[PDB]
Amino acid sequence: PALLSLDENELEEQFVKGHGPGGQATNKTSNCVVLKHIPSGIVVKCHQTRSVDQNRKLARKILQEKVDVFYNGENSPVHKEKREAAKKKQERKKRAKETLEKKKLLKELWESSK
Amino acid sequence: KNILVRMVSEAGTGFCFNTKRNRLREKLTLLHYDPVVKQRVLFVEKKKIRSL
């Protein structure tokens, strides 16, 4: 289930300062990308690194999850591995039932031994 | 791997010299120059000083 790509064009990448979570480095740095999609309305920001060579290449990796919901919907590889990896949490809380039920069958048989 | 032994002389005693040999093969017995008697005397090892 690959995530459908995005063209090299039609991506209005603005570069603003953004949020600043730091002293003086982060007020003056145009590190936040505002990588847009021109077709859909999907506006993505990023302040994930102090470097655009990992901001912009990771901002692209986020956008190709959001516009994937637009052209696929709730049946997409971005919701498949949301319903497959929270499938396990119904195989983790049901699993944990059947052993906390058999931990009283072995705890009441304990100490009712004589 | 190797062993620094001490070789005690037999004649003209007290003269020791240290040589190297393998850990595994047997104790040394050499014909070495003893300057005490100014000859060549048999030298028989006695201790191992260090297993280098």
Binding site: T99, K103, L105, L106, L109, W110 | -
Partner: protein, 96 residues
């Protein structure tokens, strides 16, 4: 003669889970349900704790009446940090 095989398994840590199935080669998954069903006895006792350690000569079970997995080695070199390559018995033979 009676039944003897299955020497030199590297177990990970002495434990009545892995001195079990390593020896009766299965996994830990039936053994944990053997544990929770009255079985998996020790030296003619009942193990109600499946992490009770195992020394030399500690006579395993599971009651299929049984099939013991006796132990005697220490074997004292190291097998890449699954160190306990210990010989161990094997059976499927009956007990009174």
């Amino acid at each position: 003669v009676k039944n003897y095989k299955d020497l030199e398994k590297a177990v990970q840590s002495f434990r009545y889970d892995v001195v079990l199935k390593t020896g009766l080669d299965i996994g830990r998954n039936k053994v944990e349900d053997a544990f929770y069903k009255g079985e998996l006895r020790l030296n003619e006792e009942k193990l109600w704790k499946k992490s009770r350690t195992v020394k030399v000569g500690d006579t395993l079970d599971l009651l299929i009446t049984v099939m013991r997995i006796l132990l005697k080695k220490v074997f004292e070199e190291k097998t890449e940090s699954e160190k306990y390559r210990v010989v161990l018995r094997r059976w499927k033979s009956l007990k009174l």
